[PDB]
Amino acid sequence: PPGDSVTVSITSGASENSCTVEKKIRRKFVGREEYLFPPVHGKLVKCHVYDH
Amino acid sequence: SITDDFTLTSPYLGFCPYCRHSTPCFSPIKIENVWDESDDGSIRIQVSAQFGYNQAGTADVTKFRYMSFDHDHDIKEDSMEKIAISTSGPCRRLGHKGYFLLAQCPPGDSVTVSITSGASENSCTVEKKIRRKFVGREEYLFPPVHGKLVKCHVYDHLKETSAGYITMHRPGPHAYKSYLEEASGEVYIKPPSGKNVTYECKCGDYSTGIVSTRTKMNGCTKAKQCIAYKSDQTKWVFNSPDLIRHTDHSVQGKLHIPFRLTPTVCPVPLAHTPTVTKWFKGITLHLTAMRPTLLTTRKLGLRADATAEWITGS
Amino acid sequence: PGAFGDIQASSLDATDIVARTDIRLLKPSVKNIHVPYTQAVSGYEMWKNNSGRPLQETAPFGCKIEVEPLRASNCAYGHIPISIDIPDAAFVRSSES
Amino acid sequence: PGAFGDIQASSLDATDIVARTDIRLLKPSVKNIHVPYTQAVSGYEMWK
Amino acid sequence: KFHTVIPSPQVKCCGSLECKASSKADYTCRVFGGVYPFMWGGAQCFCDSENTQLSEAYVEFAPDCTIDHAVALKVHTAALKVGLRIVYGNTTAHLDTF
């Protein structure tokens, strides 16, 4: 989600701790119309994403 | 006539634009409509599943019924404890009956209904602007203890009140690829275990029929030339744009829309009374306001010279 | 489309409704069954955002505006000629005053 | 009320304090015990 | 506020469809050929092409319009009525006059 920091933590155990760094993460969209979620109907345009 | 007999109705499978993996998917909890016309901030949500009834359709408030993701598709039941509503954080559930939900929600940009546990664990998110609401001419975060009671309208938490109805129709065909078979250049039909299916093929001349065992379709070499769907189904579904209608899409019955908008009274804040200074042919008002409150003036002669401004601060 | 009065009926339970909301039906571009459409905003919502100030705050002569029926009460304007016929049992002659 | 110097004392532990914060006590409108009041903002906060 | 209703679409597998006429408010209709729709069960027709689809749309009144709605009125000659208190001598009288 959008935020001002990024946190990685170990949730359980004896190693339970966090690390937070400051990092501006905002909403992104492709094209000339803003959207919250991608639509079902539309057109397919060129984009670049990280390969899972 | 509006009916309350859910034995005659069925839940269905929708197509959500945003599921638990952020992609569109077919969903048993597809959100149809969202309403936020209440003055206290409660919302009503329409869903493709039916809440507050068991598998058979008899009412029991601890269960809900949905649609199965398997080819012998029947109605399944689970527990209401798995049903979650959220916009930006969790929402509080105010009531449930049939396709509809009542919930008190935080401000947000979307609405989410999810099944929290089990093998059915998934979500459905629609885009819906939900903001803070207040009544009167002073803004508040929470209603005050001291104030005045003014006119407002809220959704009734009781599920026995009605805001309207929805129309119900007999379901159209639903062809399953698993009912077809290819065996060395020949096409068979595999109905589910001991069930009637209707087939419909164009393998030359048109053919149709109803079978209950494996049958050979004559002249067909590919399974894409045929289709097969279950026969003898009439339980009413909603007039959903994600379904394919029956040969006659006539209205078979109606279902109440619960949680109607009812007039009531709500406490609203009273502001700090101002101090007036009274110069010549004029006044000045010294105003105190933590949140925006409305100040209007007008003259009592031919011209009103009306003014209006929301004022924050002192 | 997009203005006040874009959907019209005589009554809320009326079966004949006239509307013009600029509905456009688009060709489906996906493989799942879908009816794509685009439409204009609700003129009623646009008006509720651009209604302005009511008549209870702008009426001249200090009128108070009320509904059921629509009326203005306690306005201060003009002069009213009145003719009264006093009963003669309300007059006493000067011989008694 | 509502300006710097609306509460005044010689010292912080002083027992004689003078103030003018425009306190108004209102009639209780609910059934539970309640002391409703309204007041001006802090002049010290406004000055800050 | 109106409610847009999109019915369950009509699908003809190896034939054609035509738009009809209706009395519904803002009724729109369109035919689309060369269609091959899918559901969770799979394909829904047996012709890979020439599989027209019918789309409909009209509008109704929202469920909660019974409270949130506006009434448009035309107004004509306004007539004034006043209530008067008249005290003459020892008697007071109350009356309404046009």
Side-chain angles (χ1 to χ4, degrees):
Chain A
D4 284 303
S5 55
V6 172
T7 320
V8 168
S9 50
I10 308 179
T11 297
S12 284
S15 306
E16 177 172 14
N17 212 329
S18 301
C19 185
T20 303
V21 292
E22 189 210 17
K23 181 62 172 173
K24 203 180 192 290
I25 285 180
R26 296 307 175 202
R27 195 94 52 191
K28 284 162 173 294
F29 72 95
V30 188
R32 335 210 320 163
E33 308 183 25
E34 195 196 85
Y35 51 86
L36 190 70
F37 309 113
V40 177
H41 180 260
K43 47 185 298 190
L44 291 85
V45 298
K46 175 90 163 294
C47 13
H48 309 83
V49 302
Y50 291 144
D51 201 326
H52 287 28
Chain B
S1 297
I2 308 169
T3 192
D4 271 307
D5 197 53
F6 285 70
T7 293
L8 313 171
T9 69
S10 178
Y12 56 94
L13 229 44
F15 187 85
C16 192
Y18 203 78
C19 302
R20 81 136 121 197
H21 293 327
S22 306
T23 64
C25 80
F26 288 104
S27 184
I29 43 165
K30 152 76 159 46
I31 293 168
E32 299 278 358
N33 272 113
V34 177
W35 295 278
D36 69 327
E37 300 287 337
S38 254
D39 276 348
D40 60 335
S42 61
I43 62 166
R44 157 156 27 86
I45 312 167
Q46 198 186 5
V47 192
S48 64
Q50 296 189 322
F51 304 103
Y53 297 82
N54 56 20
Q55 181 197 91
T58 295
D60 93 298
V61 302
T62 52
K63 295 180 182 310
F64 74 98
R65 60 209 293 243
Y66 59 94
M67 244 294 116
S68 189
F69 268 144
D70 74 78
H71 314 319
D72 217 343
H73 56 104
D74 300 83
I75 297 174
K76 307 281 217 60
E77 68 179 19
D78 231 324
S79 188
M80 285 299 303
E81 291 172 347
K82 299 190 179 72
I83 295 297
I85 310 162
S86 51
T87 66
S88 295
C91 304
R92 182 165 61 98
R93 155 143 42 94
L94 277 21
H96 53 90
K97 172 170 173 277
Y99 295 120
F100 298 90
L101 297 162
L102 190 59
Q104 186 79 20
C105 276
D109 280 304
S110 56
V111 169
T112 317
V113 170
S114 51
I115 311 183
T116 297
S117 279
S120 304
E121 175 171 19
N122 213 332
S123 295
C124 186
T125 298
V126 291
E127 190 213 15
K128 180 66 172 174
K129 201 180 195 292
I130 291 183
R131 298 307 176 199
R132 194 97 49 192
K133 289 166 171 293
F134 73 88
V135 188
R137 333 209 323 162
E138 310 184 21
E139 195 195 86
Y140 52 84
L141 191 70
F142 309 113
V145 176
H146 181 256
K148 48 183 295 190
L149 292 85
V150 300
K151 177 89 164 296
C152 16
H153 309 83
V154 300
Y155 291 143
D156 201 325
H157 286 37
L158 290 188
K159 79 206 190 218
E160 293 82 352
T161 67
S162 312
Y165 62 85
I166 52 173
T167 55
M168 309 287 284
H169 310 266
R170 39 179 83 205
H174 192 159
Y176 274 77
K177 177 174 73 169
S178 182
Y179 300 163
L180 303 173
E181 191 186 23
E182 279 178 347
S184 67
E186 291 195 312
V187 181
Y188 299 84
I189 279 147
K190 287 216 311 301
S193 35
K195 259 125 185 172
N196 282 285
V197 291
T198 296
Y199 66 83
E200 209 169 350
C201 303
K202 187 65 143 50
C203 300
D205 42 19
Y206 175 81
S207 196
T208 198
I210 293 170
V211 301
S212 60
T213 57
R214 256 189 50 157
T215 305
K216 177 174 140 198
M217 298 300 105
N218 303 279
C220 320
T221 51
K222 318 286 276 300
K224 76 187 205 316
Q225 295 178 327
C226 283
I227 56 165
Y229 48 94
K230 286 193 162 96
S231 313
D232 337 303
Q233 331 226 125
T234 347
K235 331 206 74 60
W236 311 335
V237 288
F238 171 64
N239 189 12
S240 180
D242 309 308
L243 271 42
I244 298 181
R245 68 174 60 180
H246 195 78
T247 311
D248 67 314
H249 200 240
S250 300
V251 182
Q252 306 289 302
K254 297 167 180 177
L255 248 56
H256 282 113
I257 305 182
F259 319 115
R260 74 173 261 268
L261 196 53
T262 302
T264 180
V265 285
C266 38
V268 293
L270 288 163
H272 195 214
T273 278
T275 123
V276 196
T277 272
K278 295 184 185 184
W279 31 285
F280 177 67
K281 308 206 79 58
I283 64 173
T284 178
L285 299 175
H286 307 288
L287 316 156
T288 300
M290 296 167 55
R291 295 192 123 70
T293 134
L294 185 56
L295 166 67
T296 71
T297 61
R298 64 175 179 162
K299 302 199 168 182
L300 307 176
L302 177 69
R303 273 154 54 87
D305 293 352
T307 55
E309 179 187 356
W310 296 85
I311 293 178
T312 313
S314 64
Chain C
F4 179 95
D6 60 335
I7 169 161
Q8 296 181 349
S10 68
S11 171
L12 279 173
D13 61 338
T15 56
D16 56 326
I17 310 181
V18 278
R20 210 134 47 192
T21 60
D22 202 10
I23 310 184
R24 319 246 181 88
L25 292 175
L26 318 169
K27 186 175 92 70
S29 55
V30 289
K31 60 184 294 189
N32 307 118
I33 229 308
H34 188 56
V35 180
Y37 73 100
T38 176
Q39 202 182 5
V41 299
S42 183
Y44 187 77
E45 304 287 296
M46 276 278 288
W47 179 80
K48 267 175 52 179
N49 218 69
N50 287 280
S51 49
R53 301 314 307 172
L55 222 62
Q56 286 85 356
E57 309 172 357
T58 327
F61 298 113
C63 295
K64 182 185 173 69
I65 304 305
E66 288 142 323
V67 289
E68 304 163 8
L70 174 72
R71 61 195 181 280
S73 45
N74 299 148
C75 308
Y77 73 107
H79 299 74
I80 303 176
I82 302 189
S83 301
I84 311 185
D85 199 311
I86 322 283
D88 281 333
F91 289 88
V92 284
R93 41 204 68 263
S94 305
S95 305
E96 291 286 351
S97 180
Chain D
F4 179 96
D6 60 335
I7 172 164
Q8 292 175 357
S10 69
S11 177
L12 280 172
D13 58 337
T15 57
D16 56 325
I17 310 184
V18 280
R20 210 133 48 192
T21 62
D22 203 10
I23 304 176
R24 319 246 179 88
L25 293 175
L26 319 168
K27 187 176 90 70
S29 53
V30 289
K31 58 183 296 185
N32 307 121
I33 230 302
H34 188 59
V35 180
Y37 74 105
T38 175
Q39 206 182 1
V41 298
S42 186
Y44 186 78
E45 303 286 297
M46 275 277 287
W47 178 79
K48 270 171 56 177
Chain E
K1 185 179 176 61
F2 55 80
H3 169 245
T4 306
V5 22
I6 312 297
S8 293
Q10 194 175 200
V11 166
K12 177 71 185 178
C13 282
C14 309
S16 293
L17 295 164
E18 216 177 37
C19 303
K20 224 86 69 184
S22 279
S23 51
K24 288 167 172 62
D26 211 15
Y27 175 77
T28 318
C29 198
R30 224 179 162 198
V31 283
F32 298 103
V35 145
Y36 200 59
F38 277 60
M39 249 132 72
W40 167 254
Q44 300 298 140
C45 279
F46 39 94
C47 285
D48 38 64
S49 194
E50 55 160 2
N51 178 14
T52 59
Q53 151 172 350
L54 199 41
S55 297
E56 296 187 347
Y58 55 98
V59 295
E60 290 176 349
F61 286 136
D64 304 319
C65 282
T66 48
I67 293 298
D68 201 1
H69 65 285
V71 178
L73 305 154
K74 288 170 144 175
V75 322
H76 321 110
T77 317
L80 177 75
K81 174 202 258 291
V82 302
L84 301 177
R85 168 178 72 237
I86 305 184
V87 32
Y88 50 102
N90 184 214
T91 57
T92 63
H94 300 270
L95 58 93
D96 301 319
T97 178
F98 279 95

